Every structure is written in structure tokens, then in C-alpha cells.
């Protein structure tokens, strides 16, 4: 199959505005939310119907208990960071863990933390160590690296457990995750040529402009791949026209193993 990934995020906020959760944790498979938990609901809940239908209540119950504990651990860690930074006010702590199963069958695994949205600690599961970006992180690095068994635990989780979960959820969601909807592509003038694609799935696509058969990445304005709201995606790319010479322009679109060329007359 195509490359797929499983990721879980955590967000902690030290002094949130009223009503706003101090803690949130959300799982994804590829771009699809699969699970959610926060300090207001205090419950782990499905965010995709193909998760609700395939995971029995004991799964949600058990991970609800674990996330209640992870919530508390997150608060304690942020409290410790903000004291050692000597920071007043509201600050954020974030975590991201996950894995990828690549098309060729190889795998990746990653775990990292951020303070106020900036990299803080990054796990290397091959050297079994933590990369610290500053001296507050360096202190945490020393404490975490002192617990060698926990580093080995995380390497096993990233390399074996996480890949196993990914494969299980990919099978649950296969009718969503493994489908292909081809793009509908058109060119218009706005002088710049716009190449516009919509209705496609998966969201990974490459659009570019060729002039006389040569790509010119520096002259191309690449639009973001954006959700259309119905499960499909849209994207665009534009190039400006040279009114001093005649040139053959063409939009090239690559999606899910299919290449398309639209030559502008």
C-alpha cells in the first residue's frame, strides 16, 4: 500500500482561559483524527466511525484511565518546565509520538516534545538518547537518560507496538484510508496561469508548471493542499506569463501513481 502513519499528540496549557482545557490528546492515522481525550470530558472517544465500530468498550475504558494519569503527568512536567524557565503566565507543552509504515515496507518511529511550540526534547531510538535544545531540556535529558529501561521500552513501543496498532487501524479504516479518488484538474487565467485540482484522495499530490518542457520551481507559486470538507482535497499552482516571448506552458499533476499533463494553447 501507500505510506501510512499513526501519531498521538498531547497539548498542555499552564494557565488556560476559562472553559479551555488544560490538557488535550488526539490520535491520527494519516490526516484522519481517530481518537480524542481532554481534561473536560475526561473520556477517550472515537473521532472516526470505523474506530468506534471496531474497538470494544473495554478499549476506550482502559485508555480513558491511562489518559487520566497521562494528563496529570503532563501537568507536573509543565509545572517543572515553567519553574525552571522561571516563566510567568500561560505556557504550552506538547508531545508527539508515532510511526510510519512506508510503501516499501520499511518503518520509522519518532517521539518529541515542545515548549511554547518550539522543539524541546527529541528522542533518538537508535542511539537511545534525548537531544536537548537548551539547558532546561538538558536537565530533563539527564533525568530521563538515567532510566535506561524506559528508553528501551520506548524503542520497542515505537518499532513494534506502534506499527502493530497502525496495521490494525489501517484494516479498520481500509475503505476510507486505502481508496483513491482522482483529481479533476483545470487551467484558467487570472497575467498568471492557474492550475487547479479538486475532489481527490489521498491528499498527497504534486502540481507544477513546465515551460518548454523544463520545470522552473523558483517561478512557481505553490498553493497548499486543502480539505474541501467532504473527505476530499483541493490544491493549485500558478505561473506568470511572459508577454515578450511565446512559450509552451503545461500543468503537470501526479496523484497516486497517475501523471496528468494539461498543455495550455
Amino acid at each position, epitope marked *: 500500500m501507500r505510506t501510512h502513519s499513526l501519531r498521538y499528540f498531547r497539548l498542555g496549557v499552564s494557565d488556560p482561559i476559562h472553559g479551555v482545557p488544560e490538557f488535550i490528546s488526539v490520535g491520527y492515522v494519516d490526516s484522519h483524527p481517530i481518537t480524542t481525550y481532554d481534561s473536560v470530558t*475526561r473520556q477517550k472517544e472515537p473521532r472516526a466511525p470505523w474506530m468506534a465500530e471496531n474497538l470494544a468498550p473495554d*478499549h476506550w*475504558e*482502559r*485508555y480513558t*484511565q*491511562l489518559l*487520566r*494519569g*497521562w*494528563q*496529570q*503527568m503532563f501537568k507536573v512536567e509543565l509545572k517543572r518546565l515553567q519553574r525552571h524557565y522561571n516563566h510567568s503566565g500561560s505556557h504550552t507543552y506538547q508531545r508527539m509520538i508515532g510511526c510510519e509504515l512506508l510503501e516499501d515496507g520499511s518503518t520509522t518511529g519518532f517521539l518529541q516534545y515542545a515548549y511554547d511550540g518550539q522543539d524541546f526534547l527529541i528522542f533518538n531510538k537508535d542511539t537511545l538518547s534525548w537531544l536537548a535544545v537548551d539547558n532546561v531540556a538538558h536537565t530533563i535529558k539527564q533525568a530521563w537518560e538515567a*532510566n535506561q*529501561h*524506559e528508553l*528501551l*521500552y*520506548q*524503542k*520497542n*513501543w515505537l518499532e*513494534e*507496538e506502534c506499527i*502493530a*496498532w497502525l496495521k490494525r487501524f489501517l484494516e479498520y479504516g481500509k475503505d476510507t484510508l486505502q481508496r483513491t479518488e482522482p483529481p479533476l484538474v483545470r487551467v484558467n487565467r487570472k497575467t498568471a496561469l492557474f492550475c487547479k485540482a479538486h475532489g481527490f484522495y489521498p491528499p498527497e499530490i504534486y502540481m507544477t508548471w513546465m515551460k518548454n518542457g523544463e520545470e522552473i520551481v523558483q517561478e512557481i507559486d505553490y498553493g497548499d493542499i486543502l480539505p474541501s470538507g467532504d473527505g476530499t482535497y483541493q490544491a493549485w499552482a500558478s505561473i506568470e506569463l511572459d508577454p515578450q516571448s511565446s512559450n509552451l506552458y503545461s500543468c503537470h499533476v501526479e496523484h497516486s501513481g497517475v501523471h496528468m499533463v494539461l498543455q495550455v494553447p
Partner: antibody, heavy 108, light 116 residues
């Protein structure tokens, strides 16, 4: 989800004994050994989660994830090693599944 | 310091009688557990408490209830003792749960015999 270890083993003082544990679990987040002297509380001995052998004093603990197998190795046995030894595995949901214990008897 | 302190060490009960087992830990641990140990089988979890402020059933919750009174204390209640509840009860704690490598710290055990 099953853990298996022998009920009882008997070895001689000064010798070496290998206590086996095999497991079939729904996922794997590590294998523990505990010591429990008769009438007393279990105490932690070891944790393994990657493959291989780890030494702590006179005790070593081995793990093979592909064989679903661990042993606890006691060298230079002493009378004080007479105890039960409990194997336990954390599954995919971090539930600990406990073996029924191996009672180790030491002949002076 | 003291580690895990549970009481009582021994208790005789008549069928139908009520009993509370006490457990406290002074190690600033977050997770606490109540197990029973019976001959011929591995430890079985009765109830656990992953963090202060939450508890949930283990594998053998029927006939029991718990209270995570605060971060230190986790009590186990037998509202109406039954002979099948004759067992050795162990309270345990760990720093967190849902992490792989952290071990359990056990109390001394409470031996209960329930008689008709």
C-alpha cells in the same frame, strides 16, 4: 493471554538454576521478574523489553521476543534464594499478566 | 521511608460481615492497585487507581469496591464477605502507569479467612 512457568524447581546450594517463563499475550511492553519469599511481599528483580541478556549481581534475565520466552538465571545459589519467582508481562494495554510462580527449593 | 503500608495483617470474618483493608504509600506514587493471591494461579487485579481522582475495575472486581481517598491512600472494601474471598490481599503502587518499565512496590499482604 497465557503465562507459563514451572510450579517448582529444586537445585543444590552453590549451583546454577534457570527459571523459564513463556508467554502468549496480546502485544508486548516488557517482561518482569519478581521474588517472593514465603509469607512476604513480592519484590522487583528485573525488566526486559528488547532481546538479550541483562545481569544484576548473581541474577541475570534473558528475553527472546520472537520465541515469547524469558529465563531468570540464578548463579552461586544460596539458601536465601529459596523463594517463589513470579514472571509477569505487560500487554498492549499495559495490563500486567502474572504467571503462577515457580517455587525454588535449595538443597544445603 | 515506609514504602507501602497495609493493614490488617490477618483477619477472620464471618460470611456476610463487612471489612475494609487500608493501604497508604509514602513514595509520592501516582498509581495504586489491589491484588489477590491464591494458590495455583497468578496474581489477579481487583481494582486499580491510575492516578489520584480515578479508579476502575480490574479482572475480579465483583464483591469488592475501592476508594482512592487521596494521593497516598487506596482502601479496599468487602461489603458482604463470602468464603471465596478467603485469600491474601496485596496493595501495590507504582510511580505512574501506562509506561512500560516502571515496577510495582508491594505492601506486606493481608491474609483474610471468611467462614460460614
Amino acid at each position: 493471554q497465557n503465562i507459563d512457568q514451572p510450579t517448582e524447581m529444586t537445585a543444590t546450594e552453590g549451583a546454577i538454576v534457570q527459571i523459564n517463563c513463556t508467554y502468549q499475550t496480546s502485544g508486548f511492553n516488557g517482561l518482569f521478574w519478581y521474588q517472593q519469599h514465603a509469607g512476604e511481599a513480592p519484590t522487583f528483580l528485573s525488566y526486559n523489553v528488547l532481546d538479550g541478556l541483562e545481569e544484576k549481581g548473581r541474577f541475570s534475565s534473558f528475553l527472546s521476543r520472537s520465541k515469547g520466552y524469558s529465563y531468570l538465571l540464578l548463579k552461586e545459589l544460596q539458601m536465601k534464594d529459596s523463594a517463589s519467582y513470579l514472571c509477569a508481562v505487560k500487554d498492549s494495554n499495559y495490563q500486567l499478566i502474572w504467571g503462577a510462580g515457580t517455587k525454588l527449593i535449595i538443597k544445603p | 521511608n515506609a514504602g507501602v503500608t497495609q493493614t490488617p495483617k490477618f483477619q477472620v470474618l464471618k460470611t456476610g460481615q463487612s471489612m475494609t483493608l487500608q493501604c497508604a504509600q509514602d513514595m509520592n506514587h501516582n498509581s495504586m492497585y489491589w491484588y489477590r493471591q491464591d494458590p495455583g494461579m497468578g496474581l489477579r487485579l481487583i481494582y486499580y487507581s491510575a492516578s489520584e481522582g480515578t479508579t476502575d475495575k480490574g479482572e475480579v472486581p465483583n464483591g469488592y469496591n475501592v476508594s482512592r481517598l487521596n494521593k497516598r491512600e487506596f482502601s479496599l472494601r468487602l461489603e458482604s464477605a463470602a468464603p471465596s474471598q478467603t485469600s491474601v490481599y496485596f496493595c501495590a503502587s507504582s510511580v505512574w502507569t501506562g509506561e512500560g518499565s516502571g515496577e510495582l512496590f508491594f505492601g506486606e499482604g493481608s491474609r483474610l479467612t471468611v467462614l460460614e
